Ligand SMILES: NC(=O)c1ccc[n+]([C@@H]2O[C@H](COP(=O)([O-])OP(=O)(O)OC[C@H]3O[C@@H](n4cnc5c(N)ncnc54)[C@H](O)[C@@H]3O)[C@@H](O)[C@H]2O)c1
């Protein structure tokens with residue numbers, strides 16, 4: 001056995017169809033009584049309906065959560081949290097809404113109850129990205145990790161098919177990189193394989209039947225396991241490269257993960273063939289190429305060109321991607337990253 | 352020959368690849384000297400670079416434009432505009448940045464120089480949507496219409512393909528309904544047909560080659576014409592239904608248009624085929640079915656089910672759609688709206 005360390009993060013995860021009906025219970029269980037419900041404008045109706053059902057347990061609704069968690073919006077939300085006399089936030093939405101709740105918690109120590117409605121997995125990580133003075137920053141710590149997560153697959157029936165597929169691939173990316181983390185451990189590896197198996201099973205079913213509650217349950221369960229390992233162990237080339245491209249070119253988040261994942265996994269697979277073998281088995285081939293074929297079954301975007309990246313962006317990106325050293329089982333090398341970017345730009349099937 | 356009224360409000364439209372390098376000359380031409388440059392948070396770097404290029408003409412940068420133009424943000428922007436002693440706004444970016452500049456102009460009478468980077472078309476309409484204490488409001492008037500628009504297709508090369516296609520269909524929707532507007536007129540109809548032609552030619556090419564400057568210039572020209580007619584004549588069933596259904600079900604705006612357009616046009620075309628003939632000619636002979644085929648070429652979503660709409664939503668939708676009587680060439684009947692929604696939900700070809 002390889003030496004390892006395993007650290008369980010504190011967690012209270014409530015999982016069941018209709019569980020968002022019991023948000024009141026969870027507020028009370030924390031000994032709290034005044035929730036500020038959070039959403040984007042695209043989920044404002046749902047946030048308002050939840051607040052309504054909470055009655056006196058709902059202190060207010062702030063429905064202006066914004067892409068990339070900009071600090072000026074967070075300042076406004078914190079003013080809303082204070083004015084409402086809130087003692088917690090209930091974050092109803094995807095990674096952008098979870099990020100707003102995390103940014104409010106950073107500033108106020110609000111307890112967080114997160115009700116995730118995508119597959120991003122932020123709800124079980126201690127990581128927070130923000131935009132300040134036009135630049136995306138990242139940090140992590142125990143004060144960011146949400147206290148309670150309520151997974152209610154009914155709230156995902158309405159997640160559109162295209163974002164369901166790319167967000168599902170974003171989840172799979174967390175699990176795939178967990179398999180070869182420098183601080184990999186057997187529990188994170190077991191959860192990663194199970195999360196991959198759940199997403200590979202569920203996403204093709206969700207594509208054909210977005211209203212199928214069984215398939216939605218399975219995909220949400222997979223998203224939870226994938227987020228848990230994002231929370232637990234170190235990511236590598238895939239997540240670093242998505243952050244570089246995402247940040248420098250303003251690319252759509254989940255789509256960037258979907259496009260890059262077959263190529264970043266193929267890059268590492270040359271060096272980590274045994275660690276990626278469970279993934280290769282699940283995709284019925286090579287880990288990188290098999291992911292590409294799986295993404296094609298889902299109809300996900302497959303080229304960086306489709307995301308608005310130009311051929312003249314590839315050299316500057318290969319430079320930025322190699323500027324700051326981090327660990328990978330295969331060392332990051334500029335020419336090899338430049339080749340990876342060219343294949344992802346082309347939408348080529350990994351070799 | 353139908354009677355008509357034609358009204359035009361002044362606007363100056365500058366269109367060329369690289370034109371955004373010439374913003375200072377446009378500000379000077381207006382006799383203005385103190386611009387507040389506007390953007391979203393993620394586009395702050397671009398706004399600050401533009402502001403640097405403006406030199407003495409830049410009075411500040413305000414980079415908090417938000418989706419749906421919340422009054423709360425507008426108040427902060429107006430405080431910044433007044434503190435900067437500004438005389439105009441330069442709205443660099445998408446529809447939400449155009450919207451912020453309009454909301455500032457309403458309150459301050461600021462002149463607006465818009466530099467659009469999307470196909471939203473807001474830069475050439477007198478319409479302003481805002482949100483106040485969570486409620487969406489809309490208004491329109493000549494004071495909201497931007498004075499100058501600088502169209503630089505080089506700024507649109509990075510617009511992702513998926514949103515390029517669905518926002519391009521949303522633009523086409525303005526032009527298609529302009530053809531049968533109660534207050535239709537020959538210039539709006541001419542501009543609508545040309546905008547449709549431009550979109551139909553350009554969008555398939557953009558999909559294959561998003562950095563092709565010629566295709567992007569053609570698409571941006573189409574977006575301009577489609578936005579102009581949105582601002583000129585009265586929309587109908589298509590725009591009503593999108594506003595209802597996208598708004599009450601919180602669906603993404605462009606996608607709702609993309610899905611519904613073949614069905615709403617097919618519905619009207621049953622009654623008014625002659626007004627839609629110019630569009631039908633551009634898409635293979637039937638306007639509604641032809642738009643369905645066109646949207647399929649682009650890879651746009653084709654059903655409401657794919658947008659997360661549930662079977663149970665269709666009923667309250669049809670009722671809500673018929674709550675306000677409004678004008679359409681074909682009488683709107685709740686039954687018929689229900690069936691149209693069901694065909695859209697299935698992704699059935701009209
Ligand atoms: N800190 C972390 O551990 C972590 C992990 C993953 C992602 N993220 C961050 O999260 C953000 C991306 O999150 P995301 O991919 O979930 O997208 P998102 O939260 O940006 O959501 C995209 C859109 O989909 C809508 N939506 C979400 N769920 C819906 C539902 N079920 N029904 C209808 N509409 C729904 C949202 O309202 C929004 O308008 C990025 O900022 C990313 O960096 C952070």
Ligand SMILES: [Ca+2]
Pocket residue numbers: 105109110111112142143144145147
């Ligand atoms: Ca805490």
Ligand SMILES: [Ca+2]
Pocket residue numbers: 456460461462463493494495496498
């Ligand atoms: Ca004016």
